[PDB]
């Protein structure tokens, strides 16, 4: 199925307890690595990362992260100067890639300032999309170094995917498993003359699930309320969908379709 690898960076100027810099990695919804300006160490966040990557890996990336921390500190100072901003502001980065079930791939690299899009890299055109004049100033400086754009295209298309395939093998017993959902339909008259139908699912992995309500075997036109896909705390997830009023709930998960006729 579809899998992804992502790395985030968070920089905070003048932090109140809160680290000045944090960086976390993820494979799908699972945290794999962490670093912050307090520990100043890159550490695993999944036992399958810890057991398959030698101490030299964590040692080398600890040094790189100490450098990337200093880079974030200085870029955020320059951004605050450009905007004429004082006090506490945030700077964020997200880099990563996706390996789609059809073998095709995606790659992304983006920055945010104070939690809003700032610069979005387009690896297919080798350009940065800027949201305002300050972002345009930065885009011009970054686009002036042709080699760094080519390096970034290669990292997103080749290195990121190779790292993702490596980690999928290390964590295959967690990441490639399937735990089917337990699904039920609850019926209840709520406000006089208003019957609510809930289709509730839990105990499933991966978190991706499709739930819908059908009427006489065809697509609905009335309002469907959707519950978020939430972690249950044991590595599995839960979700629900509801309607008010022949109804049937349809659930699709990991290549298995299920129908619950009311």
């Amino acid at each position, epitope marked *: 199925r579809t899998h992804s690898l992502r790395y985030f960076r968070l920089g905070v100027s003048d932090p109140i307890g809160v680290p000045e810099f944090i960086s976390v990695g993820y494979v799908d919804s699972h945290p794999i690595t962490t670093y912050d300006s307090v520990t100043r160490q890159k550490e695993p966040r999944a036992p399958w990362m810890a057991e398959n990557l030698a101490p030299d*890996h964590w040692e080398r990336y600890t040094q790189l992260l100490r*450098g*990337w921390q*200093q880079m974030f500190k200085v870029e955020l100072k320059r951004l605050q100067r450009h905007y004429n901003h004082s006090g506490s502001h945030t700077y964020q980065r997200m880099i990563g890639c996706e390996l789609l079930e059809d073998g095709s791939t995606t790659g992304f690299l983006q920055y945010a300032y104070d939690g809003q899009d700032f610069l979005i890299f387009n690896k297919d055109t080798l350009s940065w999309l800027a949201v305002d004049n300050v972002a345009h100033t930065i885009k011009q400086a970054w686009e002036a170094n042709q080699h*760094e754009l080519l*390096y970034q*295209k290669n990292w997103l298309e080749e*290195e990121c995917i190779a790292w993702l395939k490596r980690f999928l093998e290390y964590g295959k017993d967690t990441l490639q498993r399937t735990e089917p959902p337990l699904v039920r339909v609850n019926r209840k008259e709520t406000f006089p003359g208003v019957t609510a139908l809930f289709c509730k699912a839990h105990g499933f992995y991966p978190p991706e699930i499709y739930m819908t309500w059908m009427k006489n075997g065809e697509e609905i036109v009335q309002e469907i309320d959707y519950g978020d896909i939430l972690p249950s705390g044991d590595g599995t997830y839960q979700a629900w969908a509801s309607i008010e009023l022949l109804y049937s709930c349809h659930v699709e998960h990991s290549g298995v379709h299920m129908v619950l006729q009311v």
Partner: antibody
Amino acid sequence: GQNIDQPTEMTATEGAIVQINCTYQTSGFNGLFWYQQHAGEAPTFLSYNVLDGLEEKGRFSSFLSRSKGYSYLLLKELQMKDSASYLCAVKDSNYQLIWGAGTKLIIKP
Amino acid sequence: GVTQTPKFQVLKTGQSMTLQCAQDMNHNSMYWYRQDPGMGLRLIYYSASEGTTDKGEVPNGYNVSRLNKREFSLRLESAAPSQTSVYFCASSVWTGEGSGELFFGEGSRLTVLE
């Protein structure tokens, strides 16, 4: 990170063309560099390739084939001042530079 | 660019020595290499940014100090004949970047004699 191979030495004639090959076998790839180092002097950056193709900088061109794990440094209209050592270096998955032993280039007048 | 001292040095076995290196290019990453015949450059120690250092491939018999953003000194604790070599300091704008090249110092030729 593992192995870089380039010839120890090459000889060509003034005015002609020379191609210096560099083959690499590494754990990941983040780019290939060429440096020039004159006898008793410091190495100086010549070129960088990370995607497939040929980049020309005056009389020097650097080629890369990612699928073959192969690069070459092409020097045209050879001059006596081109006599030097040429170093090939690859950045692996952890951004460490893997250095080749260098190619001593001798130009015959 | 990169200012490395001394250019030449004769040492007796057991003598201590410090190589200096300074760059005023506002670079964050600094490196100490040794160059020996028939082999590729070998990293001794490096400093990815001010306030951090780590071993390279051949750290034994050496130590470093990233004194400030500009300076990275290399120390030979007890000079040994195996340390006879040409030492190069280098710097780059950052580390953990692909395209950034190295800027090298002029080189320090050390000869260690009994």
